[PDB]
């Protein structure tokens, strides 16, 4: 008996918010659908892939109560493709859903709402108040370094390291590491490490905006949840132990190179053209005031680049995977960055020139 009417653009906002979590892969039949609920003038749309759940709710006025599941991508595409300003009526016809707008009519197959998996209620054991923009930056500065479908499942996500007065995001794939830290206004007091899986990270990223809003991370034993107006993000946590990531952060890397971030990216990209396609190794030779950047490949082709730098370091040549160094520089934002070194056989630490809050560890590659 479910029935509601609303404008296309109003309908499109919750549809767009929730459609992205639906996995195109054919898993459980019902998982291809939204859970759609009408209760007391409120329309709720829920999508899930069992790991992440997105809910968005809106008012629909003079609706009729009811509950079903509706093919998510098809519904989203239909509503998006209808003419701007369309007045849309949705209703149940037997085991079908009907969508009417002007002369148009669409019928979709449904599956029973009882088939739809429910999230176990997140009993939050920790609430972290954090600026929405701040959390957004912590993730942007680190997410690129998460492992990608690694058999070490605990790397396929972002570590949220709650350190009392501070929060740290940490990503590693085993070959490089990115981390960013912020002080929290309302101190949490709690110390706890949680790993948010890749899909939870990206869905959370979509929800957070720029600006001065505070949000609350609700952290349970097995789930994290963010409520933002009438959108609810819930993600399972990865049930594993993140590595002792601090072990790979260099200590005693006090040989500093201060260099223009974008000029260094450009030189590295030029040298990379002639680097080994498999190993992508480039060489950085440091001398006072100067970097010599070079690469060569199995065919003996060779690139030689130079860039000025503020440094008194001499007698130091170190190899890096150019992809990892470029990733680090692309995730930094200052006009100038600092590279901290010890020697040719030790990892480099790359950071903003203006702060130590964001840090990148790039491992040496043998020359």
Question: What tags apply to this protein structure?
Answer:
monomer; 8-stranded antiparallel sheet; 367 residues; alpha+beta; elongated; 17% helix; DNA Polymerase III, Chain A, domain 2; 6 helices; 24 strands
Integer-rounded radius of gyration = 25 Å
Name the shape in a single word: elongated
Can you identify the CATH class of the domain at 3-115? Alpha Beta
Beta percentage is 35-45%
PDB class: dna binding protein
Keywords: dnaA, Stenotrophomonas maltophilia, DNA polymerase III beta subunit, Structural Genomics, Seattle Structural Genomics Center for Infectious Disease, ssgcid, DNA binding protein
Assembly: monomeric
Entry title: Crystal Structure of dnaN DNA polymerase III beta subunit from Stenotrophomonas maltophilia K279a
Structural summary, described in words:
The protein has an 8-stranded antiparallel β-sheet. An 8-stranded antiparallel β-sheet has the order 13-10-11-12-24-23-22-17. Strands 1-6-7-8 form a 4-stranded antiparallel β-sheet. It has helices spanning 8-19, 72-81, 132-140, 198-207, 261-272, 322-331, and strands at 3-7, 33-39, 42-48, 52-59, 66-71, 87-93, 96-101, 104-109, 126-131, 157-163, 166-172, 176-183, 191-197, 214-219, 223-228, 231-236, 255-260, 281-287, 290-296, 302-308, 316-321, 336-341, 348-352, 358-362. The protein is of the alpha+beta class and 367 residues long. Helix 5 runs antiparallel to helix 6. The longest helix has 12 residues, at 8-19. 36% of the residues are buried. It is found in: Cytoplasm. Residues 131-244 form the DNA polymerase III beta sliding clamp central domain.
């Amino acid at each position: 008996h479910m029935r509601f009417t609303l404008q296309r653009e109003a309908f499109l906002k919750p549809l767009a918010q929730v459609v992205n979590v639906v996995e195109r892969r054919q898993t459980l039949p019902v998982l291809a659908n939204f859970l759609v609920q009408v209760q007391n003038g409120q329309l709720s749309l829920t999508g899930t892939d069992l790991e992440v759940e997105m809910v968005s709710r809106i008012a629909v006025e003079d609706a009729q109560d009811g509950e079903t599941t509706i093919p998510a991508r098809k519904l989203f595409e239909i509503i998006r493709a209808l003419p701007d300003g369309s007045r849309i009526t949705v209703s149940q016809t037997g085991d079908k859903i009907t969508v009417q707008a002007g002369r148009s009519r669409f019928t979709l197959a449904t599956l029973p709402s009882n088939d739809f998996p429910s999230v176990d209620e997140v009993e939050a054991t920790e609430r972290v108040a954090i600026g929405e923009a701040t959390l957004k930056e912590l993730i942007e500065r680190t997410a690129f370094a998460m492992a990608q479908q690694d058999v070490r499942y605990y790397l396929n996500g972002l570590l949220f390291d709650l350190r009392g007065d501070a929060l740290r995001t940490v990503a590693t794939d085993g070959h490089r590491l990115a981390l960013c830290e912020t002080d929290l206004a309302k101190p949490s007091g709690s110390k706890r490490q949680i790993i948010v899986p890749r899909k939870g990270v990206t869905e959370l990223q979509r929800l957070l905006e720029s600006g001065d809003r505070e949000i609350e991370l609700e952290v349970g034993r097995s789930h994290v949840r963010v409520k933002r107006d009438d959108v609810t993000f819930t993600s399972k946590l990865i049930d594993g132990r993140f590595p002792d990531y601090e072990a790979v952060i260099p200590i005693g890397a006090d040989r500093e190179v201060k260099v223009d971030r974008e000029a260094l990216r450009a030189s590295l990209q030029r040298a990379a053209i002639l680097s080994n396609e498999k190993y992508r190794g480039i060489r950085v030779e440091v001398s006072p005031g100067n970097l010599k950047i070079s690469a060569h490949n199995p065919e003996q082709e060779e690139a030689q680049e130079e860039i000025e730098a503020d440094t008194t370091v001499s007698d130091l040549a170190i190899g890096f995977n150019v992809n990892y160094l470029l990733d680090a520089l692309s995730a930094l934002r200052d006009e100038e960055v600092i590279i901290q070194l010890r020697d040719s056989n030790s990892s480099a630490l790359v950071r903003e020139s203006s702060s130590e809050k964001s840090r990148h560890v790039v491992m040496p590659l043998r020359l």
